[model samples]
Target chain A: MSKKAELAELVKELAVVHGKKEADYYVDLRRATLHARASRLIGELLRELTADWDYVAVGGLTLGADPVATSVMHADGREIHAFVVRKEAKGMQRRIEGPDVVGKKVLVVEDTTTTGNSPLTAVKALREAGAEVVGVATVVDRATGAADVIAAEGLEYRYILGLEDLGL
Target chain B: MSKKAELAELVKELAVYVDLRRATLHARASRLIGELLRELTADWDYVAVGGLTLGADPVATSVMHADGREIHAFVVRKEAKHGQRRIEGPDVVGKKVLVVEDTTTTGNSPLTAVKALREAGAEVVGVATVVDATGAADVIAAEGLEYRYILGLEDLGL
Candidate 1:
C-alpha cells in the first residue's frame, strides 16, 4: 500500500466518533505503525507543499497538533523545528513553547482539522509573536470549510488526507 | 564541540522562565535529547515512556523517534478528558515504562504521571527529563523512582 493508502486505513481503523466530531487518537494511533505512517506521509506532503517556503519550525494548538509537530520534526534531511502552541498563554509569555519564533518563518501544522480553529488559532499566536506563518498543513482535514477560510487569510492550506478518504 | 556541548550552549542561550518551558522546540535540541535519553535509560530496558501534557509531549516523542528499539510513547492528562483515558497512547499496565518531561524541578507532573501509571498497573522503571531545574531527582526519588536529566541548571547557567 502507498503511504496514502496506509494512513487512510489507519485513520479509519482508529477513528472514534464523539458526538459530531471524530478523533484519530487512540492507543494504536499514537504508538503503532499507524503513527509512523502518519508522520511519514504528512511530513512528505508538507515537505513538497512548502518546498520553496523557508520555514524554521512547525507547530499548532497542543493535544492534537503535538504528535504532528514532533513527528514532522523528525523529517529526513530537514532541520524543521517543532513547537507547541498553547490554547492560551498560561503564564504571560508562555504561549509558544519550543523555539523563539520572533522574525522567524514557520509552518503551522495539525493532526486533524475542523472549522479551521486549531491552525487559525496558532496563526494568530505566531503572528503576534512576530513569526511569519508561511502556510498551514494538516494530516487529516475534515473538509468542513477550513481550506477556504485559510485562503481568505491569503495563506495556502494543504492536507494529506480527507474525511472522504477515511469514509468518515 | 560535541553534541552535548552544543546542546548545553543552546540551552544556555535559549532557556526561559516566565513559567519556563525548555526550548526543546529546536530540531537539534530535541534530536539530541532523544539520543541522550536512549543512552541514559539503556540499562533500564524500558518499553514505554511518557509524562504530563504539553511539557512532556515533545520530549516523549523525541525519545520515541530516536530509539532504535520500539519505545512506546504516552501522554497523561491532568485529569482525563476527551477520550477519558487518564493515560493516552497505550496500555501502560504490565510494561516497564519511563516517565519523562521537557524540564521539571519539583517532579510534580512526572509524579502525577507516575501515579496514573501506577494506578493502571504499569511498572514505571524511572523518570528522565531533558533539563532538570535541580532538586527534581530527589523529589522523584522520594517517590521511589530514579530521575535522570540530560542537562542541569548549573550546566545551563540558570
Candidate 2:
C-alpha cells in the first residue's frame, strides 16, 4: 500500500549475521513469504536465462539447494522437475535423486555460493550420470571466487542477489 | 496480474485429479498455495510447514519455498522406515509447525501428521490444504486446530 517492498528487504529480514561472509550470514529462504517471493523472481530469471536451453530438470546438492530447486519448479508457468544430489551414493555418494537426469539436459542451482563447490560437485555428478549440465543459478552470490571458478568452467552462472544486495 | 486467471485455468483443466499423484507431484497451479497460506497465517508464529510424504513432498517444498520469515519445510513418513526419524528436514521440536495437504477426503493424512508432530514436540500450529475435496475442514476443526484451504469444492465445481 505504501511502496512495493523490494527483494532486498526480504533478504535482510531472513538473513542472520552469524559470523562473516556467506557461510556466516544465513538467508533463511525456508520462510514462506521469502521463499515464495524468491521462487517467482528466481524462476522468472531462470526461464529468461535458460530460455534457449532445453533442460528437462533442475537440481543441485541437497539441503541447501533443495529449496532452490523446489522454489524454481513452483514458479508460475514453470513445468519442470526438481531433483537433488545425494552424498550417500556409495563411494563419493554423488548420486542424483528424483526424476532421472540420464541422457537429459539439466540445470544446476544452489541457495548461496561462496566457493561455488556444491554446484560444481552437482555438475560433475550429473555429467557422470550422462546428463548435459546446462548452467547454474544461485539465490545469493558472495562475490568470492565462485564466479571465477564457475566461469573458468565456461558454464553460464547467474545469481538473483549478491552480498551487497543483502547489505553485507 | 493475469496469474489468477492462469491459475484458475490450470485448476479447471486438472479437475479430475482424485486419483492423481501427478497433481501433487508437479502441479504448478499450487504455486500460490504457499503465499495464500502465509497470508492466512501471517499473524501465525509457525516456523515450519509440512505433512505426510509423497502427497506432501512438493507441497511441503512449495510451502518451504513459498514463504520467508523462518518458515522451513519437513516431511512425515507413513512410518519412519529409516533412521526412525519420521520428521525430515529441520527439527520441529519446540518449533511451531503448520500441517498441509494437497487435497483431503477423510482428512486422515494431516491428522496422522499432527499426531506425529505432537509426539515430536512441535506446536502443530494449524492445518492447511491446497484444495478441500469435501468438508474436511469440519473434521479438522473438531480436533481443536483451525483448518484453512486455498480452494474448496465449489471452486473446483465439485
Candidate 3:
C-alpha cells in the first residue's frame, strides 16, 4: 500500500473528523479484562498436560505467573510441586538449598517469553543439575522467533494462549 | 449462632475427608494454583513498611507484625545521585530488607534500594513493591520486568 493509502486507513480508524468519541470508546473497551483472560487460558493449558508428565511450575513473572500457574496446578490435581527461580543466586548463608530436581521430569513454566533468553538460562541450569526437561510453557509469547529458537535447542514449546490466538 | 453450631459449621467447611483421590481430583479441576500461593504465603508474611525515615515502612511493618515469628521491612531513600539511598538508623543494620512502595511511578527505585541495603550489610530477601498507577510510565517500571520475583503477576495485579 502507498504511504497515502496507509494514512487514509489510519484516519478511518480514528475519529479526527467525527470527533474523539470513537478513539475514546476503543481505549475504554480494552480494559484489564485481558489479564483475566490470559490467566484463565494458561490454567486451561496447564491442566491439559499435567496427567502425562509431572510438570514443575517455574518462572519469575513477578506475581502474574502465580495465578496462571496456580490455576494450572489446581486443574492438574495437585500431584506436582512448583519450584520458583530467583533472579539472582542468593549469597552464601541466605541461599536455601533447593531439593535436587535431578532425574525429575521438569517443565519450565514462564509467564511471558519476550526474548526467551531468561528461561533458556533456567533450562541450562536445570539440565546441568540432571533434570530431564520435558517442555517449556508460557502464558504469552511476545518475541520474534523465540519459539523457533527453543525448538532448535531441542525442547518442546507450548503456550496456553497468545494475543493473536485470542483474536487480539 | 451458638458456639457449638458455629464449631460444627467450621468443621463442615474445613474438613478434607475425601482422601487423596478426591483431593487430587479437585486439584485437577482447579489446577492446584492455590498450592503455589501457599508455598510463598505458608508460614510467613514478610513485609516492607515505612517509618518516619522509612516513610511507609512503618505502616507496612505495623500491618504485618506477628506475635510469634519475626517480620522484615524497610524504606527507600535517595542515594549519591542515581544509586541506592543510604540505609541508616537503629536495628536495621542487619535485618533483611523488602523494599515497599505504595505505587512506583518509575520502577527505577528498587534496584537502587537493593544496592543500598546490600552495601549497608543487609540482605534484600525480596522486593514487595506495588504499582497501581498504571500508565506509559509503566514501561520504565521494572518490578515485573527485568526483576525476579517469587510472587507472580497475581500478587501485584500487574
Candidate 4:
C-alpha cells in the first residue's frame, strides 16, 4: 500500500482503539520512560511504514528517542539509519553529523509529541540540506494537534502503537 | 531468565556460531583497528583468574592485557551509571583514541558500536580497529577509524 494510505489506516486505527487525545497522551508519557515496549512499538511502526522506502532517519533527544531508534535498527535491517538531535547544535564542533539523509527520502522519528516544535528543527535541518521528508512518525501524538499542526504546513504523519492501544 | 543470565546466553550464542580461534583472531586484529576486545577479555581473565584486587574495578585495557598499550578502546553498555570508567582520565585525557572491533560483516554493527563510543564524551580519533572478516578486507579507512587494520584477509591470505 502507499505510505499515505498506510499512515491513514494507522491514524484511523489509533483513533478507534484509543480516543485520539488519550492515545496522544499515552505516547507522551511513554516517551518519558525507558521501557523497551514503547520503544519497540515505535520501532515496529517505523519499519512497517517505511518498508517500501529505502531508508529512515531518526533525530530527537537521545534519552527519549534512543531505544526506539536503536531497537528499530536492530530489529530491522540497515535500510533505516537512526540519528539523534543534540541539545547543543554542533554540526562542526561536535562532529555528530550523518550524511545518510541528505538529498534522500527521509523520515524524522521522535519519541514525544509536545507543541510539535522540537522535531521541526530537525525536519528543517534535513529539508534545508535538500532532503525530501516523507513524513513525521512519533511513538505517541500527545493530541495537542502536534501532528496536525505539522500537517498544516504540508508533511505526512503516522504512528504504529499508542498508549490506549496497549490499554494504558 | 535474569539479565545477567540473558547476557550470558547471548555470549554463549556467539560462541556457538563463532569458532574460538576465529574469535581470538578477531580480538587480536582489533588492537590494530582500535577496538580492544581480546585485550579486554585477556585483562578480565587475568584479574578474575589471578584473584587479585586492584584499583576499584578491572578495566577493559587491564583485562585485554598490557601487550598493546596506548591503543584506543571504549565500552558500550546498555546503561551508563555515574562513575562508570570512561575513556577520559590522567591516562587518556589528551591521547588520540580510536575505536576497535572484533568481527563485522555488514557495516551496521560497527556503525552502532561507533555511535555508542562517540556518545561517551570522548574524542574518537578514528577506528584503529581489528576484524576477522573472513574474505573481507582488513584495512578500512572509514571516517570513524583513524588508523587502519594490519591483519586483514590479505594478512591471513584468506
Candidate 5:
C-alpha cells in the first residue's frame, strides 16, 4: 500500500476516543514513530511537502514533534537542522535547542494539531528569536479547524493525513 | 583522506567557544553522524539507537537513516517528570539498543536514559557518542555497559 493508505490504516488502529459531549479523537502517532517504515513515510511526506521551501530548520513542541522533526531532518539529507521547542523556557532564553535558529527560515512540525495552540506557541517563540516560520507540517490535523487558525497566523499548513481521512 | 579525517576536519572547523569556563562544538553533523555511526556500530547488532532529547536528536536520527537497516529510533526525555516522562517512540521491551549523545563529560545524561530504558525492559547494549570527555568511560563501565565514541577531548582540540 502507499504511504497514505498505510497511515490511514495505522490511524484507525491507534486512535483513542476521549472528551464528554462532543467526543475528541487522538491519533497516537508515537507508535508510528517507532516503526521505521511509518517514520520514513512521515519523513518522506515532510520532504515532499516542503521541497520548494527554503527553510533552514524544523521543529515544534517536544515529545510529539521530536520524532517528526528528527526524522524529517534525516530524510531531507540533513540539509536542514532540527530543534525542540519546549512548552515553556526552562532557562532564561526561549529554549529552542539544536542548531541556532536566529535569522534562519524554519518549518514548524508536529505529530498532530488539536487547538492549534501548540504550533502557534512555537511559531511565536521562533519569531521572537529572529527565525521566520515559513510553514507548518504534521501527520494528522485532527480536523479541529487548525488550518484556518494557523493560516490566521500567516503560516502555510500541510499535513499527511487528517481525521476524515482516518474515518475517525 | 578518510571519512574519519573528514569528520575530524569538520569538528575543528565547527566547534565554538561558549564561555570562558565552557567551550562548545556545534556541527550540522546529521549526515556525518549517520555515516560515522553506521561505520562504527556495524558489528554491534543493535536493533535501535536513542539518547536524551535535544542533544541526541540529530545523532540518533542520523544513525537510523544511514544504516537503512530499519533499526528503530527513540528519544528519552531528561526525566520522568511532568509531561516529559515517556519515551517518545516505540515501547523498548526486549530490544537490543544503543544510547547515543553528542558529547559526554559526567555521563549523567546517557545514564539517565539507560535507567529509563532498563525500567521499561529494554536491554541497553551500549552507549555511543560524538565526543567522550576523559571521565565518561568509567561512569558507563560502572553501569556494566561498553562506551564507544568517535572523538575524544583531544580530537576536539580541547
Candidate 6:
C-alpha cells in the first residue's frame, strides 16, 4: 500500500476513544513515530504539501512536534532548519532554535491537532518574532474544529488524515 | 573532511563557553548532534532511543532518521514520572534502549531518565550525549550503565 494509505491504517489501529455518555476520543500517533516507515511518510506528506511554499524552517511545541519537524528537515534534503518552540520562552532568550527565523518564512509542524491552539501558538510566536508563517502542517487532524480555527488565522492548514479517516 | 571531524569543528564553534558559571552557555546544535548520533550508533543494537525533553528531542529524531532501523524514539518529561510511573513515549516495557541528551554536566538528567526507564521496564543499554562536560562517567557508573559521548570538556578546551 502507499504511504498515505499506510498512515491512515496506522491511525485507525492506534487511535483511542473512551467514555460512555459523550464518548471522548483522541488520536495517539506517538507510537507510529517509532516506526521508520510511518514517521518518514508523515514527513514526506508534509514535504509535498509545503513544497511550493518558501518555508526556510519547520518546528513547533516540544516532544510531539519536535520529531515531525526534524523528520521533515531530514526528508526535505534542502538544508531547511528544524526548531523547537517552547510553550513559554524560557528566561529572555528567543523561543526558537537552529537558524534565526526573523525575516524568513517558516512552517509550523504538529503530530496531531485537536483544537489547533498549539500549532497556532507556535505560528503566532514565529510571527511575533518577525517570521512569516507560511502555513501549518500536521500528521493527523482530530477534527475537533482545528481546521477552521487555524484557517481563521489567515494561514493555510494542511493535514494527512482526520477523524473521518479514523471512523470517529 | 570526515563527518566526525566536521562535528568536532562544529562543537568548537558552537558549544564552548568562556564564562565560568552559566547553565545556558551552549549554542543550538540539534542538526549536527543528530547526524553524529546516527553515525555513532551505526553498530549498536538498541531497539529504542530517547532522552529528557528539549535536549534529547532532536537527538532521538536524528537517530531515528539516520539508522532507519525502525528503532523507536521517546521522551522522558521532567516530573512526568512521579512515584506513579508516568513517563512519556512508546511503551518500552522490554526494549533495549539508549538514553540520550544534548549536554551532560553532572549526569542528573540522563540518570533521571534511566531511573524512569527502568521503572517503566526498559533495559537501558547505555547513555549517549553530544557533549559531556564532566562527572558523567561516575554519574552513569553509579546508575550501573555505560556512558558514551561525542565530545567532552577537553574537546571544548575548557
Winning candidate number (lDDT): 1
Encode model 5's per-residue lDDT on A29-52: one tens digit a residue. Answer: 776765667777788778887788
lDDT (Cα, tens digit) per residue for candidate 2, span A46-146? 56656776787887875567656766677656478777776534411125665557899888988778788879999888888998988888877878888
Please report, as a residue range, the 10-residue window in candidate 5 chain A with the lowest summed lDDT.
A16-25
Ranking by lDDT: 1, 5, 6, 2, 4, 3
Distance (Å) between predicted and true CA of A144, model 5?
Answer: 1.1
Model 6 interface CAPRI class: acceptable
Better of 2 and 3 by lDDT: 2
Per-model tally of clashing residue pairs = 0, 16, 30, 22, 0, 0
| Candidate 2 vs 5: which has more lDDT | 5
Can you tell me which runs of candidate 1 are displaced by over 4 Å?
Answer: A14-37, A91-93, B16-22, B79-85
Q: Is candidate 4 or candidate 6 better by TM-score?
A: 6
lDDT of 3 by residue, B1-158 (tens): 13223322322232221111111112221122122222333333333322212222222322232222334333444523110124422225666444543233344455566566667766555443322223313443433322222222233233
Model 3 interface CAPRI class:
incorrect
* B-chain TM-score, candidate 6: 0.79
List model 1 lDDT by residue over A9-98, tens digit each: 766655443442455543223433224345555566567756887888888987777777777777786788877788785533478877
Deviation in Å, model 4, residue B121 alpha carbon: 21
lDDT of 6 by residue, A89-122 (tens): 5622346765467898888999888788989989
**Fnat per model, in the order shown:** 0.55, 0.13, 0.04, 0.00, 0.37, 0.34
Which residue segments of model 4 deviate by more than 4 Å? A1-41, A52-56, A91-96, A166-168, B1-158
User: How big a share of the true inter-chain contacts is recovered in candidate 1?
Assistant: 0.55
Clashing residue pairs for model 5:
none
The per-model DockQ list reads 0.52, 0.13, 0.05, 0.04, 0.32, 0.36
Q: Comparing candidate 1 with candidate 2, which one achieves the higher TM-score? A: 1
The TM-scores of all predictions, comma-separated, are 0.86, 0.59, 0.40, 0.43, 0.86, 0.87
After aligning candidate 5 to the native by TM-score, how far in Å is the CA of A18 from where it should be?
9.9
Number of clashing residue pairs, candidate 6? 0
